[PDB]
Design a protein around this ligand. Structure first.
Ligand SMILES: CCCCCC/C=C/C=C/C/C=C/C/C=C/CCCC(=O)O[C@H](COC(=O)CCCCCCCCCCCCCCCCC)COP(=O)(O)O[C@@H]1[C@H](O)[C@H](OP(=O)(O)O)[C@@H](O)[C@H](OP(=O)(O)O)[C@H]1O
Ligand SMILES: CCCCCC/C=C/C=C/C/C=C/C/C=C/CCCC(=O)O[C@H](COC(=O)CCCCCCCCCCCCCCCCC)COP(=O)(O)O[C@@H]1[C@H](O)[C@H](OP(=O)(O)O)[C@@H](O)[C@H](OP(=O)(O)O)[C@H]1O
Ligand SMILES: CC(C)CCC[C@@H](C)[C@H]1CC[C@H]2[C@@H]3CC=C4C[C@@H](O)CC[C@]4(C)[C@H]3CC[C@]12C
Ligand SMILES: CC(C)CCC[C@@H](C)[C@H]1CC[C@H]2[C@@H]3CC=C4C[C@@H](O)CC[C@]4(C)[C@H]3CC[C@]12C
Ligand SMILES: CC(C)CCC[C@@H](C)[C@H]1CC[C@H]2[C@@H]3CC=C4C[C@@H](O)CC[C@]4(C)[C@H]3CC[C@]12C
Ligand SMILES: CC(C)CCC[C@@H](C)[C@H]1CC[C@H]2[C@@H]3CC=C4C[C@@H](O)CC[C@]4(C)[C@H]3CC[C@]12C
Ligand SMILES: [Cl-]
Ligand SMILES: [Cl-]
Ligand SMILES: [Cl-]
Ligand SMILES: [Cl-]
Lengths: 699, 699
């Protein structure tokens, strides 16, 4: 057809059936081309390998970017505490891997220990946090506004067919890559693991621009984006299987069979890239590499389930809190000052985090410490009480304070105009809760070994209880409660920790949290953010009442004027242009005759206008007076049959709306023409269905 | 409607849309019921938990049955070599865990070592193999003919909507459980891992009857069956994640999001049940628990890729060979003697297996030995050469003979009328090939360490090459080549071996095999067997030519007589009964009037006859003369509007058949009514689509 036909405007959903049709047509054209010449055969071979090439490129880019982001974030976070003068590039761990590393008090005051030294370290920590937060927020605001947030909700919307031009562009990729490091260094209650999914998706789109097959077709690009998201999760947690599971379960609306293996290969490639730079570019959580000698016991499930509950409860709170706060940001005036809000939040976070050791420590390092088990070699404060008796109260008090601080700050941190992730904060909260619960259980076992359960399961005076396992279970429970992921979450946690023996516990806790979350609402944080942003997302959970019928959702209805229709013949180009300008319809039905109202096809408004303009430019005399004939082949009438869709999806008025919604979800229909007695009556658009579902939810 | 309405006959596909509609109606009824009484609330709570209960029951039963089958198979297989008189229940390993265990030569001849002892052991081995094979085949033939084969192809067909009454019944479960042990003990080239999926599916189907929700609805039962298949794979390989991946990728036509977590929970429950009885009921492959000290090196990929190629090639051969042989069994007279064929095949297998040590050893134990690495503690013959220099030729010769014997015997073993699995033979062939390749690579490294690759990657005089990893890679490659599974296979292998370091190699090899297999055909062994059996399976790969249109596939066509249709009114019950008897159509369209040909609905033949008979019994005077009115409410006309489907799926004649196939696959439509100019013209049934695809394939 005319060039530009089939293209989609910004902020508009795609029609998956049409995309598959163009993909099939292009495949047929290439199949016929091969026989023509050997160069055509080579081009077809390249096209067949285009999927492998694009997924490999996306995985390589995701791994490299994840490594660079990890290294830069670690160095910048260590920069707050001090500086390694001997090796400026080296961070605190590398500097001491110490006299070379000097705290800011040593740099300025000259005294490593003292009230003035502590005060100066406090001010410098706050100043560095503020500087990093301000730089991040300014960079997002100036260059790439889309770089803010995790991006998982927008990726979910896009993979459902939605289009957000510039979200996965080069500008967003670069700005998000820099701002993730800046925000993580700032000490805000956020993580970079989730946003790596968006980073990988941006890389995948950029590489898809290279291959004509994926660039031309939106559905193919969305499969590439699903593979990219799998690779992003893999690099985030070193969980390629977990990444594939997340892609299938969370972000991929449609997950064909081949896309599974493509995503797995991309994730493995990205993980291998990270491993090649190991351990420089691998987060210490990704390199947890720790095991618990004592196998988990059946009675320990009861605490784990409890943790599960807590997780769910916390999620039920967080989804209710953050959303509300976010809604206020969208409704109140404080959302008009993103830079000021970010700076203030960073200031409060640093101010309350510096006094407490756990909060001051970087969140990923705190999660690592909590997951690590206690032992004679370990000198962590958490184990001090175990060394003292076998102060527990002081450690528990500090851990509870850190838990409360993290819980309160994550609500006000998620949603701000900087790249923020919820995975790391949720894992930290759950890990602190699990560490507290495990410490309590160990103390109960040691003090009350006379109990038959403790005596039978654990030998008298034996450290059967491992706080690290409890912390891992709590982190998984909190993540399940907030995100509502069930299997992908468990596999990701297992791959991050490497402990298969603890698969059964984790799952259990996760499920409990999920169920508890479902008690207060079946919508996850990502889904809630999708709804808050107003994106056109249709989900399987959403459903219509049985009484609802297609006639109810028909666009023309009663109050609205008669729906715009196009006669096949006897219509001028000026008439089509006037109809295009008058109405904002995604497309117009085309009928045999005005009186007959017999559906002939459905011509997209964009395609109609593009074809009319291209014909005007190509052929002289088309001043709008010439007629347009949608039928198959002086006036020189314009032919618009090519743009016309000859087999639009048709449903009856008496059809239940549940079947219509199922058709829309399975086939990804942009619109469906409701016809009565063989004649056109109305159109039900995905926008209309989404509007009706939103109205039902608001009720 | 009338009782029995909506039920499906045997060997008939189900309509997923209708199943979902009845599920929604039942859910609405229960939702309204809860408010009526507290007992209704408790019933609704039970119904909501019915999925968890059914999946838990399926997992428990699958784990218990897998453990029992493993124990019985191990004991029976050891029975062939000899007997433990001191403890008859104990097998060879348990007896020596030796003087207590006595070979049949000791029992009869009285001499443990001697030419007569070897001869007698040979005869007793053959006799036990024949006895077990005869008992297995007779048990399948007499009680449960469906117990034969792996059952994965039939489960694939069933999960696509097909109905095979009795396949998942109690008789099949019991007979298959006994016959799997009998066949595995017989020494035939088959495994019990794959068939365990069918066992789990039978357990799930049996348990579904307890819960009304799953028993009443076929689609719900099929989700339970998907969870059951995941649990079966989990027990087979101790790979719950691999089990879920297999369920999603191989057997589940539709995999809703909730079914993912349900399958994961069922698999974990079954694996935990196996672990509780550990190590008695766990196959030694499931308890491989072995690691390779030397990490895999990049150059070792080149052998692995080579192994991949071999795998694919072997698969391409096997699918072409076995199918052909299987086809001969269906076409020739030797398929009329299943007992004789089974006995003869067992005789040849035992005769050629006894002389060679690897073949005589049980296939699972041979796979374990091949996967295990060589070391000073190990006394295996495979490592003898390594001890001698560091006879290799003798070990390689024996391994090659075992490879050829297994490859030839698996072709004639798969498809016989006994429970047989392809997973274990495929892994055995691949493991033997990988062990040979790894031995060759190690010998090259030791002899030619001067090579820059070997010297750089491996220190001079260092055993960097690990034959166990090569054997694992070869097993994965062969399994990928024959089954064509990509991600589930890799995850299953990883969980079976427990080595996450070797995910990248495995995948690589698997990929190569798949690609190589795709060079000789894109249909796997299960798909090829589905096609051979003639089951009505529609796959995404199958597609129609662009020129094909709905009118081409319309049932009435030209030569065929006018399609049967039912007038809404003015028709007698005798007329409907006569139409039912005359035609074998799944259902009849109902129209406003004969002349108008305006589609009103679609009434299933089964529903029509059931409603007519039930009305005749319920109401007197219905002797066939009374008229039937399909319209909404002395003659006392019968009302058949309830059975009538008021919103049948309708498509246009000029529609491309590719869109029709996509609609059928996504929505699982039993039939689609092709209407032209608002009037009914024909029907395209899933049977018609499958027939057209089969015709295209035959060409
Ligand atoms: C070490 C630290 C780690 C850093 C991370 C490295 C990886 C990041 C990738 C590099 C990309 C680079 C960013 C180029 C901007 C771009 O390239 O920006 C396009 C507009 O000109 C321009 O270059 C403007 C450039 C003005 C001066 C640049 C100063 C340089 C700054 C200093 C640092 C640079 C160092 C990077 C090295 C690596 C517009 O292109 P975009 O940025 O792609 O945005 C839209 C989107 O792509 C849509 O895609 P979608 O439909 O798939 O969503 C399209 O459709 C739209 O097309 P349209 O132009 O027709 O509207 C398109 O604008
Ligand atoms: C230790 C060793 C390990 C062993 C493994 C244990 C687990 C196995 C489960 C136990 C089942 C037991 C098998 C009962 C037969 C059954 O129960 O057979 C139903 C027909 O009477 C009968 O009992 C016939 C019984 C004649 C005498 C039994 C002698 C006893 C033999 C000696 C050993 C017994 C020890 C077992 C203990 C455990 C017909 O029922 P079926 O066997 O279920 O076959 C069809 C299918 O279920 C369709 O299901 P689908 O639509 O989902 O495909 C339905 O729809 C059809 O219904 P219809 O009858 O209306 O046609 C239905 O016939
Ligand atoms: C267009 C995009 C996909 C290209 C991205 C290429 C990236 C992944 C490349 C560029 C430079 C590469 C690195 C260059 C050097 C080394 C040192 C070597 O001992 C291990 C691999 C390692 C660490 C490479 C890893 C992969 C790497 C980071
Ligand atoms: C926002 C981020 C990217 C900016 C990072 C810049 C950092 C590394 C810069 C900014 C200010 C710098 C310090 C400024 C002054 C001095 C005193 C000198 O005698 C030693 C180096 C030292 C202590 C510098 C170390 C590096 C430093 C901390
Ligand atoms: C209706 C179906 C699902 C019920 C199946 C129940 C099965 C799974 C039950 C019945 C008997 C049970 C066993 C009974 C005793 C023991 C010993 C204990 O130290 C470990 C668990 C173990 C080994 C149990 C495992 C589970 C088991 C095998
Ligand atoms: C098909 C399968 C299930 C049948 C299993 C039955 C097996 C275990 C039976 C059949 C024949 C039996 C043997 C027959 C005779 C004797 C001699 C006696 O002095 C010791 C026991 C011994 C050696 C028996 C051991 C058990 C035995 C091997
Ligand atoms: Cl994160
Ligand atoms: Cl996130
Ligand atoms: Cl098997
Ligand atoms: Cl099998």
């Amino acid at each position: 057809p005319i060039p530009g036909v089939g293209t989609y405007d910004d902020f508009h959903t795609i029609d998956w059936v049409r995309e598959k049709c163009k993909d099939r047509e292009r495949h047929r054209r290439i199949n016929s081309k091969k026989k023509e010449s050997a160069w055509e055969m080579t081009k077809s071979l390249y096209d067949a390998w285009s999927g492998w090439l694009v997924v490999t490129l996306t995985g390589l880019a995701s791994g490299a970017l994840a490594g660079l982001i990890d290294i830069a974030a670690d160095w910048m976070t260590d920069l707050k505490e001090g500086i390694c003068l001997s090796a400026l590039w080296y961070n605190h761990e590398q500097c001491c891997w110490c006299p070379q590393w000097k705290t800011w008090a040593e740099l300025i005051i000259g005294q490593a220990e003292g009230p003035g030294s502590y005060i100066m370290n406090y001010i410098m920590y706050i100043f560095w946090a503020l500087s990093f937060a301000f730089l991040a927020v300014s960079l997002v605001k100036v260059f790439a506004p889309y770089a803010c947030g995790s991006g998982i909700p927008e990726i979910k919307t896009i993979l459902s067919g939605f289009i957000i031009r510039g979200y996965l562009g080069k500008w967003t990729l670069m700005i998000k890559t820099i701002t993730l490091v800046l925000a993580v260094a700032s000490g805000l209650s956020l993580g970079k693991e989730g946003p790596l999914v968006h980073v990988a998706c941006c890389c995948g789109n950029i590489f898809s621009y290279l291959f004509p097959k994926y660039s031309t077709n939106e559905a193919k690009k969305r499969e590439v984006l699903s593979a990219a998201s799998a690779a992003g999760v893999s690099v985030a947690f070193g969980a390629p299987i977990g990444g594939v599971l997340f892609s299938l379960e969370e972000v991929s609306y449609y997950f064909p069979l081949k896309t599974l293996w493509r995503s797995f290969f991309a994730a493995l490639v990205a993980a291998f890239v990270l491993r090649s730079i190991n351990p420089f570019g691998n987060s210490r959580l990704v390199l947890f590499y720790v095991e618990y000698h004592t196998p988990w016991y059946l009675f320990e499930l009861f605490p784990f389930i409890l943790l599960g509950v807590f997780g769910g409860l916390w999620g039920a709170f967080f989804i209710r809190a953050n959303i509300a706060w976010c809604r206020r940001r969208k409704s109140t005036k404080f959302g008009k000052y993103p830079v000021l809000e970010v700076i203030i939040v960073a200031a409060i976070t640093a101010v309350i985090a510096f006094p407490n050791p756990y909060t001051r420590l970087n969140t990923s390092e705190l999660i690592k410490e909590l997951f690590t088990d206690c032992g004679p070699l370990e000198s962590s404060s958490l184990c001090d009480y175990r060394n003292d008796m076998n102060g527990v109260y002081s450690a528990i008090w500090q851990l509870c304070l850190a838990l409360i601080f993290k819980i309160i700050m994550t609500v006000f941190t998620f949603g701000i105009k900087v790249p923020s992730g919820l995975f790391i904060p949720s894992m930290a909260i759950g890990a602190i809760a699990g560490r507290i619960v495990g410490i309590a259980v160990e103390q109960l076992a040691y003090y009350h070994h006379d109990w038959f359960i403790f005596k039978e399961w654990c030998e008298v005076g034996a450290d059967c209880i491992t706080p690290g396992l409890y912390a891992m279970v709590g982190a998984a429970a909190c993540l399940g409660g907030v995100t509502r992921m069930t299997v992908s979450l468990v596999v990701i946690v297992f791959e991050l920790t490497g402990g298969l023996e603890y698969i059964v516990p984790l799952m259990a806790a996760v499920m409990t949290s999920k169920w508890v979350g479902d008690a207060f609402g079946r919508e996850g944080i990502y889904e809630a953010h999708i709804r808050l942003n107003g994106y056109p997302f249709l989900d399987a959970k959403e459903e219509f009442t049985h009484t609802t019928l297609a006639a109810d959702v028909m666009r023309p209805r009663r109050n609205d004027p008669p729906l715009a229709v196009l006669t096949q013949d006897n219509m001028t180009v000026d008439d089509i242009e006037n109809m295009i300008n008058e109405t904002s319809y995604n497309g117009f039905p085309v009928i045999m005759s005005k009186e007959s109202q017999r559906l002939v096809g459905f011509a997209l408004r964009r395609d109609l206008t593009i074809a009319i303009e291209s014909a005007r430019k190509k052929q002289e005399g088309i001043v709008g007076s010439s007629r347009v004939c949608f039928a198959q082949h002086s006036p020189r009438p314009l032919k618009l049959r090519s743009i016309l869709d000859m087999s639009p999806f048709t449903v009856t008025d008496h059809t239940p709306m549940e079947i219509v919604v199922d058709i829309f979800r399975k086939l990804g229909l942009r619109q469906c023409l409701v016809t009565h007695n063989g004649r056109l009556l109305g159109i039900i658009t995905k926008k209309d269905i989404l509007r009706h579902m939103a109205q039902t939810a608001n009720q």
